[PDB]
């Protein structure tokens, strides 16, 4: 659980053979986590939204994805979910970029086939079609011979920001409004973030890069924070365990449901304590510091996503 992990949650990186292979829909939790390990979710996203053929993450899988900045805390725990991961699990949507979605400076974009960043009001992904990759500015997809196989290394995927996503405790609208107000009081000179009204202004400068801590608590936009405290609570509920049928791969949905509800399977010490125990299927803890709980503005919430990442902001003009 708490120990930092250098590797997949459950599944070793994919060795695909057929760029035209189907991406099956899998119902089981561990089946989905295996796909997350293999970057099959980012491959699916690229096929749906960019008319890309094949896969990203060939041989490398999720733990060889690129981050901006390279110094990244939450990737040291394989079990902490990124926005693309949370999207695959149905907790949020990484949307297709529109031209008005601002591409932040700083990442090294040249050659990427996919990148995403949190935005003030969501999560946006940028893709490229077959045989293409991003220019240095990230603005266009140009022709690239190195992508011909359609079985691309994980370095072709870029995730922007230090981000952890998790099941949240939903809050009332009135709690969100109070959090938003405290946020406005901490950044009173900020007008728009990623094109979204943050404070009312008359004049404002052009958008400039903006590095900020933030949390996603549902509702219409993120809460950006300067003074705030975070704490990690270790939890041991069923999302905290994955199940492997060793030899075959991840356990099936029905096998996993049985282990987690009926105490008739194998697992690590914590899984036997909470779920019960007796080849077979075995379930063990994923690696993370826990669930993040945020104190801000006199309140305390369990958000959907928390992190530090780069957005675009406009400042008020006198």
């Amino acid at each position: 659980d708490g120990i930092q992990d250098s590797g997949p949650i459950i599944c070793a990186g994919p060795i695909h053979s057929n760029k035209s292979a189907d991406i099956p829909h899998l119902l089981g939790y561990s089946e989905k986590i295996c796909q997350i390990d293999r970057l099959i979710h980012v491959s699916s996203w690229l096929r749906n939204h960019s008319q890309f053929q094949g896969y990203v993450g060939q041989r490398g899988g999720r733990s060889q994805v690129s981050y901006y900045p390279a110094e990244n805390s939450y990737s040291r725990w394989s079990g902490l979910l990124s926005p693309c991961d949370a999207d695959w699990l149905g907790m949020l949507v990484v949307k297709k970029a529109k031209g008005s979605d601002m591409i932040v400076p700083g990442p090294s974009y040249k050659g990427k086939v996919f990148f995403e960043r949190p935005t003030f009001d969501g999560y946006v992904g940028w893709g490229c079609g077959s045989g293409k990759s991003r220019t240095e500015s990230g603005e266009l997809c140009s022709s690239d011979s190195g992508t011909s196989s359609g079985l691309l290394p994980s370095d072709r995927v870029l995730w922007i920001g230090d981000v952890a996503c998790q099941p949240m405790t939903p809050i009332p609208e009135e709690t969100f409004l109070e959090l938003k107000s405290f946020s406005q009081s901490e950044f009173p000179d900020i007008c728009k973030i990623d094109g979204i009204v943050f404070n009312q202004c008359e004049g404002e400068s052009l958008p400039q890069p903006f590095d900020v801590a933030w949390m996603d608590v549902g509702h219409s936009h993120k809460i950006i924070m300067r003074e705030h405290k975070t704490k990690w609570v270790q939890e041991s509920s069923s999302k905290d365990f994955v199940c492997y049928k060793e030899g075959t791969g991840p356990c099936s949905e029905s096998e996993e449901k049985t282990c987690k509800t009926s105490g008739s399977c194998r697992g690590d010490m914590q899984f036997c304590k909470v779920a019960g125990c007796e080849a077979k299927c075995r379930c063990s803890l994923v690696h993370k510091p826990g669930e993040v709980v945020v104190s801000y503005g006199g309140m305390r919430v369990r958000p959907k996503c928390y992190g530090f990442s780069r957005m675009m902001a406009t400042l008020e003009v006198n």
Partner: antibody, heavy 123, light 108 residues
Framework: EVQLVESGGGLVKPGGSLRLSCAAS????????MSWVRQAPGKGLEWVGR??????????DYAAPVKGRFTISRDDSKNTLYLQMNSLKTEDTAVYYC??????????????WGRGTLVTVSS | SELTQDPAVSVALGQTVRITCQGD??????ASWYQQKPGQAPVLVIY???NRPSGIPDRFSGSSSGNTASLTITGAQAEDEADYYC???????????FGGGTKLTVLG
């Protein structure tokens, strides 16, 4: 079949001039950033400079020790990278490599190298 | 700005050695790593976050932490005796900077 071949190396007098070229094959040369990297005998690798693809502005950048005397250029129609060396000093004596990022796309991930050509600056 | 490497490091045949590169660019951007044997052109072995070019065995691996990047070689062989260079972009992004190199000696 994807390869880079440097040529033009040889003996040049101190203060002299020398043009290196690099012939690329097996890929669309026009899409590639092309870099020169040199290594004086027994010393470390030293980036000389690069020219970007036209897609990215086709601009040039040079290491400080060669700025002003070295000029990089490309002719996409003949698949060739150039390094024009002027005012050569004896410490410019090195093996010169052209290199690019072919499969490991990214400005400094040099996975494709030529074999290098030796330049000797001597009297 | 510059990448600092140790000039020399030894490892016993079959053992693990770790070569470290340090520089302020590495907080934002990844290093890449090059193996150069005498009389030969450099060969790229690690780039990005622990990506291997095709034909590079996973005995070579990459990591970064803070302003340092590290190359780790498990099960050292005689064929690993080489100079190992890290590189990266500078602050502006207009240049490429190589580390000074680390000569790896394989004992035994």
């Amino acid at each position: 079949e994807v390869q880079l071949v440097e040529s033009g190396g040889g003996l040049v007098k101190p203060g002299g001039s020398l043009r290196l070229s690099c012939a690329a094959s097996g890929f669309t040369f026009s899409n590639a950033w092309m870099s020169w990297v040199r290594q004086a005998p027994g010393k470390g690798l030293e980036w000389v400079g690069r020219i970007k693809s036209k897609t990215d502005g086709g601009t040039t950048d040079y290491a400080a020790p060669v700025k002003g005397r070295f000029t990089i250029s490309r002719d996409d129609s003949k698949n060739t990278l150039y390094l024009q060396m002027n005012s050569l000093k004896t410490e410019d004596t090195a093996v010169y490599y052209c290199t690019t990022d072919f499969i490991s796309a990214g400005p400094w991930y040099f996975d494709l190298w030529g074999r290098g050509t030796l330049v000797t600056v001597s009297s | 700005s510059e990448l600092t490497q140790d000039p020399a490091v030894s490892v016993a045949l079959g053992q693990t050695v770790r070569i470290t590169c340090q520089g302020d660019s590495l907080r934002s951007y990844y290093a890449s790593w090059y193996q150069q044997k005498p009389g030969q052109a450099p060969v790229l072995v690690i780039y990005g976050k622990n990506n291997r070019p095709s034909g590079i065995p996973d005995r070579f691996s990459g990591s970064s932490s803070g302003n340092t990047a590290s190359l780790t070689i498990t099960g050292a062989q005689a064929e690993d005796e080489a100079d190992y260079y890290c590189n990266s972009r500078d602050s502006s992004g207009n240049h490429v900077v190589f580390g000074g190199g680390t000569k790896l000696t394989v004992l035994g």
